[PDB]
């Protein structure tokens, strides 16, 4: 009961580009929670079995904490979602734009 919009890769902040690069490489990640399973408890992303989704920090420039920006990856190649509000809303990353 909220759809998922789309955001163009080109329109993401440079730190999100950094995160995506790190996920492609397998690390290194700055925070201990980077790579843990995202449970999708609120049902905002499509329902899958547990383990389908993993979460990664997107650094917020000038923040002393992990902040609220994240990439969630799904099991399918290039299936990535960006949130800037600690999972209150998501947009699917569109690599073709």
From Swiss-Prot:
Cysteine disulfide links: 8-97
Active site location: 55, 86
Cellular component, GO annotation: extracellular region
Enzyme class, first EC level, given as a word: lyase
Record's keyword terms, sorted: Disulfide bond, Endonuclease, Hydrolase, Lyase, Nuclease, Secreted, Signal
Family to which the UniProt record says this protein belongs: Belongs to the ribonuclease N1/T1 family.
Name of protein: Guanyl-specific ribonuclease Sa3
Location of this fragment in the whole protein: 45 to 141 of 141
